[PDB]
Design a protein around this ligand. Structure first.
Ligand SMILES: FC(F)c1cccc(CSc2ncnc3[nH]cnc23)c1
Length: 167
C-alpha cells in the first residue's frame, strides 16, 4: 500500500492521473520523482522548468555542479540527484527530443532507467515540448517499465485521450 490517490490503473504496474506533477510531488513526497531532463540538466521549461521553479532553483544549482563534475548525460540516460522539497530523490531522465532530431527508439532506453526504482512518480517521457506522441510514450512505458509507475498528465484533454485510446 502506498499514498498515491485517485489514479486509474492501466496495467499490473502502471497507473495514470490528470495532475500537475509539481503539486502531486508536494503532496505525496514520493521516494522518487522523475524529471523530463535534457543532457545538460538545464531546467528551463516544460516539466523540468516547473520542478526546478518549485525548488526555488536549488535543483538547477545542484545540477550545474553535477555537470561541472561529470559532463552531460546521454540521451536515454539518467542520474539520481536530490528531490529537494518535492521528493527524497529526483531521477533526471533524458528522453529523445524530437524537436532536436533525436532517435525515438531511444525512448525505450530512457524508460529502462525507471526499472532501477521500485516506485516512481513520473511524467510521460519525450511528451510535451520534447515533441513525441504521448500515446506512443505511454505504450513504450507500459511495455518497458516493470516497477510501479504513477504517471501524472498535466493536460486534462490529453489525459482523457490517453485513457480512451489505451489498448
Ligand atoms: F507555470 C509554471 F510555473 C508551473 C508551476 C507549477 C506547476 C506547473 C505544472 S507541471 C507540468 N508541466 C508540464 N508538463 C507536465 N506534465 C505533467 N506535469 C507537468 C507549472
Amino acid at each position: 500500500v502506498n499514498s498515491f490517490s485517485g489514479y486509474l490503473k492501466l496495467t499490473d504496474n502502471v497507473y495514470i492521473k490528470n495532475a500537475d506533477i509539481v503539486e502531486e510531488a508536494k503532496k505525496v513526497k514520493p521516494t522518487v520523482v522523475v524529471n523530463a531532463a535534457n543532457v545538460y540538466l538545464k531546467h528551463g521549461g516544460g516539466v523540468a522548468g516547473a520542478l526546478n521553479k518549485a525548488t526555488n532553483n536549488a535543483m538547477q544549482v545542484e545540477s550545474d555542479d553535477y555537470i561541472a563534475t561529470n559532463g552531460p548525460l546521454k540521451v536515454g540516460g539518467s542520474c539520481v540527484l536530490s528531490g529537494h522539497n518535492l521528493a527524497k530523490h529526483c531521477l533526471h531522465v533524458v528522453g529523445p527530443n524530437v524537436n532536436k532530431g533525436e532517435d525515438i527508439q531511444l525512448l525505450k532506453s530512457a524508460y529502462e532507467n525507471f526499472n532501477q526504482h521500485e516506485v516512481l512518480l513520473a511524467p510521460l517521457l519525450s511528451a510535451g515540448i520534447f515533441g513525441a506522441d504521448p500515446i506512443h510514450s505511454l505504450r513504450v512505458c507500459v511495455d518497458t517499465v516493470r516497477t510501479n509507475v504513477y504517471l501524472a498528465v498535466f493536460d486534462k484533454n490529453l489525459y482523457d485521450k490517453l485513457v480512451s485510446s489505451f489498448l
